[PDB]
Short mmCIF file of C-alpha atoms and ligand atoms in Angstrom, two decimals:
data_model
loop_
_atom_site.label_atom_id
_atom_site.label_comp_id
_atom_site.label_asym_id
_atom_site.label_seq_id
_atom_site.Cartn_x
_atom_site.Cartn_y
_atom_site.Cartn_z
CA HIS A 4 -15.65 -15.94 76.32
CA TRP A 5 -16.44 -13.45 73.14
CA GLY A 6 -14.07 -13.98 70.22
CA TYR A 7 -13.85 -14.61 66.62
CA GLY A 8 -15.20 -18.14 65.93
CA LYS A 9 -18.16 -19.65 65.00
CA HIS A 10 -19.70 -20.04 68.57
CA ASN A 11 -18.60 -16.74 69.99
CA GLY A 12 -17.91 -14.53 67.10
CA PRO A 13 -19.42 -11.21 65.82
CA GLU A 14 -22.81 -12.73 64.96
CA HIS A 15 -22.99 -13.65 68.73
CA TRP A 16 -21.98 -10.47 70.47
CA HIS A 17 -25.74 -9.09 70.36
CA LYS A 18 -26.21 -11.36 73.30
CA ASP A 19 -23.96 -10.18 75.86
CA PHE A 20 -23.78 -6.56 74.32
CA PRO A 21 -27.21 -5.57 72.97
CA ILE A 22 -25.60 -2.20 71.53
CA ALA A 23 -24.31 -4.71 68.69
CA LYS A 24 -27.34 -4.03 66.95
CA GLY A 25 -27.29 -0.36 67.67
CA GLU A 26 -27.47 2.91 65.48
CA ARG A 27 -23.96 3.80 65.30
CA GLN A 28 -21.95 0.55 65.05
CA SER A 29 -18.51 0.04 63.56
CA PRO A 30 -17.07 -0.71 61.27
CA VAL A 31 -18.55 0.09 57.97
CA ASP A 32 -18.11 0.07 54.21
CA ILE A 33 -16.81 3.46 53.01
CA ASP A 34 -18.29 4.32 49.94
CA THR A 35 -16.21 6.33 48.37
CA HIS A 36 -18.78 7.78 45.86
CA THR A 37 -21.49 8.52 48.44
CA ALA A 38 -18.96 10.45 50.97
CA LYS A 39 -19.41 14.01 51.17
CA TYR A 40 -16.23 16.04 50.88
CA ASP A 41 -16.43 18.59 53.96
CA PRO A 42 -14.28 21.85 53.25
CA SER A 43 -15.03 22.89 56.85
CA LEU A 44 -12.93 19.95 58.53
CA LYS A 45 -9.93 21.13 59.65
CA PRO A 46 -6.48 19.32 59.14
CA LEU A 47 -6.09 16.87 61.52
CA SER A 48 -3.27 17.05 63.73
CA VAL A 49 -1.06 14.32 64.98
CA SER A 50 1.06 15.04 67.79
CA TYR A 51 3.08 11.82 68.54
CA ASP A 52 6.71 13.32 69.20
CA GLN A 53 6.55 12.82 72.90
CA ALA A 54 4.82 9.22 73.32
CA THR A 55 5.44 7.30 75.81
CA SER A 56 4.58 3.50 75.19
CA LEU A 57 4.82 0.97 78.26
CA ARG A 58 3.88 -2.51 77.26
CA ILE A 59 2.78 -4.82 74.96
CA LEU A 60 -0.13 -7.44 75.60
CA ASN A 61 -1.53 -10.36 73.89
CA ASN A 62 -5.16 -9.89 75.07
CA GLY A 63 -6.60 -12.91 73.51
CA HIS A 64 -8.13 -10.83 70.86
CA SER A 65 -5.17 -8.92 69.52
CA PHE A 66 -1.80 -7.67 70.60
CA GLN A 67 -1.88 -4.00 72.16
CA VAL A 68 0.90 -1.38 72.72
CA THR A 69 -0.14 0.67 75.64
CA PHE A 70 1.04 4.14 76.26
CA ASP A 71 0.96 6.79 79.43
CA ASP A 72 -1.73 8.59 78.75
CA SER A 73 -1.60 10.92 82.15
CA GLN A 74 -0.39 13.97 80.30
CA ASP A 75 -0.56 15.22 76.75
CA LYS A 76 2.04 13.58 75.36
CA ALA A 77 0.59 11.95 72.28
CA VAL A 78 -2.53 13.47 71.32
CA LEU A 79 -4.82 13.79 68.33
CA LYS A 80 -6.77 17.25 67.31
CA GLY A 81 -8.34 19.32 64.82
CA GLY A 82 -10.17 17.38 61.76
CA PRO A 83 -13.52 16.57 62.92
CA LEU A 84 -12.61 16.74 66.69
CA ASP A 85 -13.14 19.31 69.35
CA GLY A 86 -10.49 19.37 71.91
CA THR A 87 -7.72 16.93 72.63
CA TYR A 88 -7.76 13.34 72.74
CA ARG A 89 -4.94 11.23 74.09
CA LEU A 90 -3.45 8.07 72.72
CA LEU A 91 -4.05 5.12 75.23
CA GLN A 92 -3.14 2.25 72.99
CA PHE A 93 -3.10 0.65 69.60
CA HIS A 94 -3.81 -2.68 68.35
CA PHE A 95 -4.35 -4.55 64.85
CA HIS A 96 -6.96 -6.61 63.11
CA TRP A 97 -5.73 -9.07 60.67
CA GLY A 98 -6.84 -11.90 58.30
CA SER A 99 -5.53 -15.52 57.58
CA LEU A 100 -5.04 -14.62 54.06
CA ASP A 101 -3.76 -11.27 52.50
CA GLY A 102 -7.62 -10.57 50.68
CA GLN A 103 -9.42 -10.34 54.29
CA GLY A 104 -8.53 -8.65 57.67
CA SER A 105 -9.60 -5.19 57.78
CA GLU A 106 -12.62 -4.04 59.76
CA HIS A 107 -13.71 -1.17 57.36
CA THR A 108 -13.63 -1.72 53.75
CA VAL A 109 -13.77 1.10 50.96
CA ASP A 110 -16.22 0.36 48.21
CA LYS A 111 -16.44 -3.25 49.79
CA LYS A 112 -12.36 -3.65 49.06
CA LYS A 113 -10.86 -5.37 52.39
CA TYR A 114 -7.21 -4.75 52.95
CA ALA A 115 -4.73 -7.50 54.93
CA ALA A 116 -4.85 -5.78 58.30
CA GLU A 117 -6.19 -2.49 59.80
CA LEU A 118 -4.35 -0.54 62.67
CA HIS A 119 -6.62 1.14 65.50
CA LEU A 120 -4.86 3.84 67.31
CA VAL A 121 -7.38 4.46 70.54
CA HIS A 122 -7.65 7.88 72.02
CA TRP A 123 -9.88 9.55 74.44
CA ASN A 124 -11.23 12.90 74.98
CA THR A 125 -9.46 14.74 77.72
CA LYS A 126 -12.41 16.77 78.51
CA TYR A 127 -13.54 13.28 80.37
CA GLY A 128 -10.65 13.16 82.38
CA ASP A 129 -9.83 9.14 81.99
CA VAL A 130 -10.98 6.60 79.42
CA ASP A 131 -13.54 4.84 81.60
CA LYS A 132 -15.77 7.87 81.94
CA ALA A 133 -15.02 8.69 77.97
CA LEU A 134 -16.53 5.20 77.23
CA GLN A 135 -19.51 6.24 78.33
CA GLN A 136 -19.69 9.40 76.29
CA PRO A 137 -20.75 10.10 72.80
CA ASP A 138 -17.92 11.72 72.06
CA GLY A 139 -15.61 10.15 74.40
CA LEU A 140 -13.23 8.21 71.80
CA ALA A 141 -11.71 8.88 68.51
CA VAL A 142 -9.89 6.08 66.62
CA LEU A 143 -7.37 6.25 64.03
CA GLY A 144 -7.77 3.77 61.66
CA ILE A 145 -4.85 2.76 59.05
CA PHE A 146 -5.14 -0.09 56.50
CA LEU A 147 -2.44 -2.26 55.99
CA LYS A 148 -1.49 -3.87 52.40
CA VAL A 149 1.29 -6.13 51.64
CA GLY A 150 4.14 -4.85 49.68
CA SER A 151 7.40 -3.58 50.90
CA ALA A 152 8.19 -3.75 54.67
CA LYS A 153 7.53 -0.85 56.98
CA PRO A 154 10.39 -0.47 58.91
CA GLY A 155 8.76 1.41 61.73
CA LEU A 156 6.63 -1.76 62.43
CA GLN A 157 9.57 -3.74 62.54
CA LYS A 158 10.31 -3.47 66.32
CA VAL A 159 6.45 -4.64 67.29
CA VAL A 160 6.96 -7.72 64.72
CA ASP A 161 10.27 -8.49 66.82
CA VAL A 162 8.84 -8.76 70.08
CA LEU A 163 5.66 -11.09 68.97
CA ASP A 164 7.32 -14.13 69.83
CA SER A 165 7.75 -13.28 73.44
CA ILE A 166 3.91 -12.69 73.77
CA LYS A 167 2.39 -15.70 71.86
CA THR A 168 -0.68 -16.57 73.96
CA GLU A 169 -3.22 -14.91 75.74
CA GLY A 170 -2.30 -12.94 79.09
CA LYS A 171 1.50 -12.49 77.88
CA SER A 172 3.10 -9.13 78.17
CA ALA A 173 6.46 -7.64 77.80
CA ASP A 174 8.25 -4.31 78.45
CA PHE A 175 7.76 -1.91 75.20
CA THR A 176 9.14 1.27 75.96
CA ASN A 177 10.59 4.13 73.79
CA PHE A 178 8.44 2.98 70.86
CA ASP A 179 7.52 5.56 68.39
CA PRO A 180 4.07 5.55 66.69
CA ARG A 181 4.95 8.00 64.10
CA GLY A 182 6.70 5.19 61.96
CA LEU A 183 3.29 3.59 61.48
CA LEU A 184 1.63 6.54 59.76
CA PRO A 185 1.19 6.78 56.18
CA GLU A 186 2.53 10.04 54.14
CA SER A 187 -0.80 11.58 53.71
CA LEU A 188 -3.56 12.16 56.48
CA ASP A 189 -6.64 12.56 53.95
CA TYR A 190 -9.19 11.03 55.89
CA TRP A 191 -12.71 9.67 56.03
CA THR A 192 -14.69 10.34 59.40
CA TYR A 193 -18.08 9.22 60.96
CA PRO A 194 -19.35 8.51 64.23
CA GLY A 195 -19.43 5.20 65.22
CA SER A 196 -18.37 2.77 68.05
CA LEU A 197 -15.65 0.39 69.65
CA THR A 198 -15.25 -2.92 67.15
CA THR A 199 -15.07 -5.03 69.85
CA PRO A 200 -17.10 -5.48 73.11
CA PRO A 201 -18.28 -3.40 75.05
CA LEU A 202 -18.95 -1.88 71.33
CA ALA A 203 -19.55 1.37 72.99
CA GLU A 204 -21.01 4.29 70.53
CA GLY A 205 -18.27 6.68 71.58
CA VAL A 206 -16.01 6.89 68.96
CA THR A 207 -15.31 9.47 66.15
CA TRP A 208 -13.97 7.33 63.42
CA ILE A 209 -10.72 8.84 61.58
CA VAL A 210 -9.90 6.45 58.68
CA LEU A 211 -6.94 7.39 56.61
CA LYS A 212 -7.31 7.04 52.97
CA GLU A 213 -3.56 5.91 52.29
CA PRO A 214 -2.78 2.37 53.42
CA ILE A 215 0.63 1.45 54.63
CA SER A 216 2.67 -1.31 53.32
CA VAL A 217 3.79 -4.39 55.15
CA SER A 218 5.93 -7.06 54.03
CA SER A 219 4.74 -10.63 53.79
CA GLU A 220 7.13 -11.37 56.57
CA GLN A 221 5.92 -8.91 58.74
CA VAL A 222 1.99 -10.03 58.46
CA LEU A 223 3.41 -13.70 58.73
CA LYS A 224 4.51 -13.06 62.23
CA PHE A 225 1.36 -11.48 63.14
CA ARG A 226 -0.54 -14.84 62.56
CA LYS A 227 1.72 -16.76 64.56
CA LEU A 228 0.08 -15.60 67.64
CA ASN A 229 -2.41 -17.47 69.68
CA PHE A 230 -5.77 -16.59 70.76
CA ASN A 231 -5.40 -19.38 73.49
CA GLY A 232 -3.65 -19.24 76.84
CA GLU A 233 -0.41 -21.06 77.44
CA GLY A 234 -1.27 -24.82 77.57
CA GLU A 235 -4.55 -24.61 75.68
CA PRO A 236 -5.03 -26.18 72.32
CA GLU A 237 -3.22 -23.83 69.68
CA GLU A 238 -5.69 -21.49 67.82
CA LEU A 239 -3.96 -19.04 65.82
CA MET A 240 -4.96 -15.53 66.19
CA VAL A 241 -6.20 -15.00 62.80
CA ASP A 242 -9.52 -13.20 61.40
CA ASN A 243 -9.92 -10.77 64.22
CA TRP A 244 -11.99 -8.79 62.73
CA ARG A 245 -15.49 -7.66 63.01
CA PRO A 246 -17.50 -7.19 59.70
CA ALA A 247 -18.91 -4.22 58.26
CA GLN A 248 -22.14 -3.10 60.27
CA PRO A 249 -25.20 -1.00 58.64
CA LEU A 250 -24.53 2.51 58.17
CA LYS A 251 -28.02 3.63 59.37
CA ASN A 252 -28.88 7.00 59.14
CA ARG A 253 -25.19 8.01 59.49
CA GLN A 254 -22.95 10.12 56.53
CA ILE A 255 -19.18 9.63 55.95
CA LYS A 256 -17.58 12.69 55.27
CA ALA A 257 -14.24 13.32 53.62
CA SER A 258 -11.32 15.76 54.16
CA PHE A 259 -10.14 15.51 50.64
CA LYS A 260 -11.88 15.97 47.22
CL1 CL B 301 -14.90 -20.16 74.36
ZN1 ZN B 302 -9.46 -1.96 66.63
#
């Protein structure tokens, strides 16, 4: 199966998913001195007050919290986006050490981890149809650095013991994703792709400039998860990140000066 190891990792993905070598792949390095301030972007609207979380799952490549996306309950609008994008799930990418783990980089800087909140465009009616459109998805990306604990992450951290191995899931209702956001909504944006197979070139990326800090204990708990299924040789779920891909003929825009 695809993964992050020497024999199944990102350099192999193109064989089953040739779009891996496509024209708008993610992640990318964000060169902050080349990104263009765009005074015409709108402020981004993040409306998570009615969010309805459902489950938490170890999918063998990350852990993910899934939401009810049957109505406009937790949505992203504005910024570079036209229309309304519904939150389907969030997940993380992280490292074996604190100096790597993020997918996007900022002037080549890697963060300890990166949070992806994955949304789909309601004009396409469901996520599977949205996945086939060039404007079907929007991913809000948030960097994590190690420092003080993030209180709004702690309920996630405390359930990870119950989903150690691939295919395990647990109830995860009443989780508020507002507790994962930094103060500022200043962002970079560019057109890109999902960073895991199928690597679909349908994502408007919105990457926040301000990281959140998480504690060393919080990230240690991420690193106790397993890639493997129950009973298989233990292979810690660490370094589940795709490295930066070629920018090609894209422009990164900034919402701030
Ligand atoms: Cl394998
Ligand atoms: Zn991701």
